[PDB]
Structures are given as C-alpha cells and as structure tokens.
Design a binder for this molecule. Structure first.
Ligand SMILES: Nc1ncnc2c1ncn2[C@@H]1O[C@H](COP(=O)(O)OP(=O)(O)O)[C@@H](O)[C@H]1O
Length: 135
C-alpha cells in the first residue's frame, strides 16, 4: 500500500528506483517506515526513472501477474538490480528489520498509466506505476 502523499508514480520511484543505500537493510527502512511494516521482499532496479518512462513506450503486453491487465511493458534489455529479502522480521520496531541483498541483471516488466492529473509533473504524461515482474 502507499502513503497518501504519493502518486503511484512517485511510490514506484520510491520503492523501485531510488535505492537510498546500496545495502538493503538501510534502503528498506525508507519503504518500511512509509508502509508501517517490513515488506517481505522488494526489487530495486538500478536504472533511471527516465529509462523506465521510455520502457512505458514499448509495446503493450499482458501483465504476467494479472491476466486481465494490458498496460504492461517489457524493458527490452536487462538491467542491474538488487533484490531485497527480509531475514529478520522484528515484530515491534520496524527499524530493526534486516534484509539480505541479491544482485542480478534481469529484464523487467512494468505497468504504466497516465499521470496523476493533479500531482504528477506534466513532464511525463505516462509513468510506471507498478513493477509486475523481473526475468
Ligand atoms: N497492472 C497494474 N496497473 C496499475 N496498477 C497496478 C497493477 N497491478 C497492481 N497495481 C497496483 O499497484 C500497487 C503497487 O504494488 P508494488 O509495490 O509494486 O508491489 P511489490 O513491489 O510488493 O511487488 C499494487 O499494490 C496495486 O494496488
């Protein structure tokens, strides 16, 4: 789920593009502090927001996760990425959650939609809103 101050595009960026630290335990604190819980796993794509926006321009395809959605797009090429896996749940005090990190170079599929009319900058009429899968 996402905090109210974020549009889907900004939340996508916060969760999958802006890895604030190369260490998952530190990077995941941002996501967990916003979601008020420790996300079991999360993928950080080591690419630019602009690159993802352009991927939104690639041919539409069915989303591997939801066979009813047709707003997904394949990256075309592989990109470096870090996958974070929760290793220490820490019931109370989510800042104590620890994660393992898995580096890899894979293709990705993202779902994109028109920008939030009121909050997203007009610069990008089309933006990624969900990471559907990595291959
Ligand atoms: N095809 C889709 N198009 C637009 N929005 C979607 C789509 N699929 C899922 N969503 C929404 O986007 C949210 C973002 O999920 P996300 O953070 O990307 O999941 P995770 O990173 O745990 O895989 C979902 O919880 C859902 O409400």
């Amino acid at each position: 789920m996402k905090p109210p101050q974020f549009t889907w595009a900004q939340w996508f960026e916060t969760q999958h593009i802006n890895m604030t630290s190369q260490q998952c335990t530190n990077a995941m604190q941002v996501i967990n502090n916003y979601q008020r819980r420790c996300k079991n796993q999360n993928t950080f794509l080591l690419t630019t927001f602009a690159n993802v926006v352009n991927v939104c321009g690639n041919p539409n395809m069915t989303c591997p996760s939801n066979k009813t959605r047709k707003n997904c797009h394949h990256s075309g090429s592989q990109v470096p990425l870090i996958h974070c896996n929760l290793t220490t749940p820490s019931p109370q005090n989510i800042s104590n959650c620890r994660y393992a990190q898995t580096p890899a170079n894979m293709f990705y599929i993202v779902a994109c939609d028109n920008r939030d009319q009121r909050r997203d900058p007009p610069q990008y009429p089309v933006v990624p809103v969900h990471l559907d899968r990595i291959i």
